Amino acid sequence: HMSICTSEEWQGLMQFTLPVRLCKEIELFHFDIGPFENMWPGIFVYMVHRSCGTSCFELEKLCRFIMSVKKNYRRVPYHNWKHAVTVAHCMYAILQNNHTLFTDLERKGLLIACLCHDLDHRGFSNSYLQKFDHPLAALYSTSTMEQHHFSQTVSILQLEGHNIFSTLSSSEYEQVLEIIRKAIIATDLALYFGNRKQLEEMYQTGSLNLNNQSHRDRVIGLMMTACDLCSVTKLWPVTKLTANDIYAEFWAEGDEMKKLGIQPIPMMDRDKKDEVPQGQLGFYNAVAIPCYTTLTQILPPTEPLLKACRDNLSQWEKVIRGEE
């Protein structure tokens, strides 16, 4: 059921060399992978090697894994291969700036979780799957697509020669799979609201303790949200272009809803594009800004993400004022 990369594909990745000039740029939060499509798999290999070490994973297995993951992302407008690498890069930047706060197991687990977090996404939301009783909603009662993304991740690891984690001891192996599962489930925005509120409180009252596993899990969860939404932390033109892709998917879902006789929310109605600017303002105020605000409080080095988010909020406000 899973697609598998070809030998030419993973061998080509093995020989890939990343232009010296990009090595420097990849360390920055605002880096946009957009103009280097042929290099995306190589960029991920580079980040893994820099954060986890060149011998962390058997190179051959890592290349097979990466190219098969790419092949299992669909050709949809937004939840695609580009998105996966973009989210993984934001995680890389967060980890590089807060390196020793995380174990080697967590770093390899999180970079992989980010690359795989939207595996096999079809362009339809949990809202849609549950409203229309898709088989996946029956199998996974909550965080439907996310539970599916994790299942897809495990399925790729099970492909012959694709298990990059097999060299871990049995206890570390079970630990990394759990790190990956929790990280992917955390990408369900529905869970973000409660997670952020809890973390904000733990931080404000001084009870937040990274030696407390449940606390670590929550911090990692907020990091996942931050990486998943990072298009809002890029330079304005990049942020705006990505929003076009996000809405292309929203509109397609809303079209299907109308076919089933249900009026979609304005955000998914292609006949209500005039409401987009206000919709974005709402998303930034209710989701993005608070996310990066709390993340910066817990991990000070991530402040550039919050500053960039605030800048884009201002841009959407300019659009609303007719200054576009």
Ligand X SMILES: Nc1ncnc2c1ncn2[C@@H]1O[C@H](COP(=O)(O)O)[C@@H](O)[C@H]1O
- Residue 134 assigned ligand-binding role: no
Among 152, 163, 187, 302, binds ligand X (CB under 6 A): 187
Least distance in Å: CB of 19 to ligand X?
28
Least distance (Å) between residue 234 CB and ligand X: 11
Q: Which CB atom, from 187 or from 296, has the smaller least distance to Mg ion?
A: 187
Q: Could you give the CA distance from residue 67 to residue 115 in angstroms, rounded to a whole number?
A: 11
The residue among 52 and 186 lying less far from Mg ion, judged by its C-beta, is 186
Q: Number of residues in contact with Mg ion, rule: CB under 5 A? A: 2
Instruction: State the Cα–Cα distance between residues 212 and 229, nearest whole angstrom.
Output: 26
Q: Which is nearer to ligand X, 4 or 189 (CB)?
A: 189
- Cβ at position 119, least distance to Zn ion in Å: 10
Smallest separation (angstroms) from ligand X to the CB of 118: 5
CA dist., res. 194 & res. 201, Å (int): 11
104 marked as part of a ligand binding site: no
Is 118 near Mg ion (CB under 5 A)? yes
32 binds Mg ion (CB under 5 A): no
Place of tokens 């406000």: 317
CA dist 316 and 240 (Å) reads 9
Residue from 61, 64, 70, 79 binding ligand X (CB under 6 A):
79
User: Quick check: is 134 catalytic?
Assistant: no
Record the tokens describing residue 167, joined without a space: 């060299």
Token digits for 309?
């988010």
Helix intervals (H) in the chain: 7-15, 20-25, 40-52, 59-71, 81-97, 104-116, 126-131, 135-139, 144-157, 170-186, 189-205, 213-228, 236-259, 276-283, 289-298, 303-320
Interface with ligand X, residue 228, by CB under 6 A = yes
Q: Quick check: 253 binds ligand X (CB under 6 A)?
A: no
Residue 246 engages ligand X in binding (rule: CB under 6 A):
yes
153 contributes a contact to Mg ion by CB under 5 A: no
196 is an interface residue for ligand X by CB under 6 A: no
Residue given tokens 């030696």 in the structure block: 211
Q: How many residues bind ligand X (CB under 6 A)?
A: 12
For Mg ion, give the closer residue by CB, 199 or 224: 224
Report the alpha-carbon distance of residue 46 to residue 50 in Å, rounded. Answer: 6
Q: Is 148 annotated as a binding residue?
A: no
| Identified catalytic residue from 49, 79, 162, 215 | 79
DSSP 115-181: HHTTTT--S--HHHHHHTT-HHHHH-SSSHHHHHHHHHHHHHHTSTT--TTTTS-HHHHHHHHHHHH
For residue 324, what is the DSSP state? -
- Residue choice 153, 187, 239, 315 for contact with Mg ion (CB under 5 A): 187
Q: Residues annotated as binding site for a divalent metal cation?
A: 83, 117-118, 228
Q: Residues annotated as binding site?
A: 79, 83, 117-118, 228, 280
Q: Any idea which residues carry the catalytic annotation?
A: 79
The residue ranges that bind ligand X (CB under 6 A) are 79, 117-118, 187, 189, 228-229, 232, 243, 246, 280, 283
